[model samples]
Target: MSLQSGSEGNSPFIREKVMEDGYNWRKYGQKLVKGNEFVRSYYRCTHPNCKAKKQLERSAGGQVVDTVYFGEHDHPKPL
Candidate 1:
């Protein structure tokens, strides 16, 4: 048996958000938020389907935090 090595990469959308001005986020939860009549889907780092699990929740009164990187990724690669 053989194993292959790979490099880690971030999503373009996430990169843009990080570079953008006046932006902030907080991941209260990543579970299914629920949708209209149907179960809405969400992305989290643990799932292989999710490229990069990140949740961006706008702060109250529009006051933004400079830069806050949350969570520690334990996955070796994208599932």
Candidate 2:
């Protein structure tokens, strides 16, 4: 399940800056999602128990503007 939220869990997810969550992410893969103009970078939370993931839609200049977090965190934020 995908969670459409940001750092505070109340704002829109932005990619231009680091997401201030209590977890760290490691890029595992990248793909092109349907209906979007750019590529989506897949990130997995570093915490083994949390198992949360994020899909970042990167812009042409390598800027991130849209983000989608999938799955709920089993623990507190990491950042």
Candidate 3:
């Protein structure tokens, strides 16, 4: 099953800096989705044998609106 999370805000805005969640994620795909305004980004864990996947959706102004996570990490967190 996939887990989902979203920001607390209803509007989008510009960001001054980038934020990291401390996971070594490698983005492997990006494409537009039907009936959606923003494109979605697909990411997978960089760790060997890890099957964790993440789908990220951002607003036009670059605010993270929706994030979906699939599978749990079999190993510990990355530094």
Candidate 4:
């Protein structure tokens, strides 16, 4: 289960918060690890011959606290 702070409808703040500021990110998985109080979400970039991945940490208050990028993009972003 996720946190519920603002209940405003018609605005995708939560969705946008999770799925924005990146290029073609596809949700891979959410994992729980030791020494962390929150879950880490994995996002893989969908680019040709690319090996980029993003790992975002979400706090209990539904806020992203950390964002980690792995590997470099082999090509430019789609137009």
Candidate 5:
């Protein structure tokens, strides 16, 4: 996997959020929030077809936002 700067990608905002606080993500859908210039990327569990996903929104402060976990997730087993 390639590690690139979060501030330079399609989901810079989300990357910044993860950098600030370690996040567990499972992408599903991506939508552009109204009035926002960036497209939001949705993620669910890294596991195959896991339903635990969250939506991340960028705050006005540009340093913090909200993460809405829509469902519950069972702890993943070690590989």
Candidate 6:
């Protein structure tokens, strides 16, 4: 199967923290990973042909950590 991705959300402050870097990201999918109490989330940049992505994570303790990002934006930060 052929597939592709595009950028796109979250609850207020948590989203604020995740989005503080200023890249528009879309949730690709979610999975269960070890160590983290919560599910692992997948995110990608919105730019065309941009190879950037992220794995957004939090803990059972309600902390928004474990979020890992890779690559850089092909364009400038938003206005």
Candidate with maximal lDDT? 2
- Model 3 / residue 59 / CA error / Å: 2.5
lDDT of 2 by residue, 1-79 (tens): 2332342443323454544664466787977756456677877877777657776777556656776777886555453
lDDT of each: 0.34, 0.62, 0.61, 0.61, 0.50, 0.59
Model 1 lDDT at residue 77: 33
Which lDDT tens digits does candidate 1 get at residues 1-79?
1112112233314434443432222243532223332222223544433344453322333222222334555543332
In model 2, residue pairs whose N, Cα or C atoms come closer than 3 Å (at least 3 residues apart or on different chains), thus clashing, are: 21-79, 22-77, 22-78, 22-79, 23-78
Candidate 4 to truth, TM: 0.56
Question: TM-score of each candidate?
Answer: 0.20, 0.53, 0.59, 0.56, 0.43, 0.53
Error of 3 at 48 (Å): 1.7
Give the clashing pairs for model 5.
26-43, 26-44, 26-45, 27-42, 27-43, 27-44, 28-42
Which TM-score value belongs to model 1? 0.20
Model 3 spans > 4 angstroms off = 1-22, 34-37
- Candidate 4 error regions (>4 Å): 1-22, 33-37
- lDDT of candidate 5? 0.50
**TM-score of model 5 relative to the true fold?**
0.43
For all candidates, the clash counts are 0, 5, 0, 0, 7, 0
Q: Stretches of candidate 2 above 4 Å error?
A: 1-22, 32-37, 77-79
* Candidate 4 residue pairs in clash (backbone atoms < 3 Å): none
TM-score quality measure for candidate 2: 0.53
For model 6, residues 1-70, the per-residue Cα lDDT tens digits are 1112122222212434543555666778877667566666777776668888777775575545555667
RMSD of each: 15.7, 7.5, 8.1, 8.1, 9.7, 12.1
Model 5 per-residue lDDT tens digits across residues 6-73 = 43234423524443324344457757666566556566766555666656665344432444655554
- The residue-level lDDT of candidate 5 at 6 comes to 44
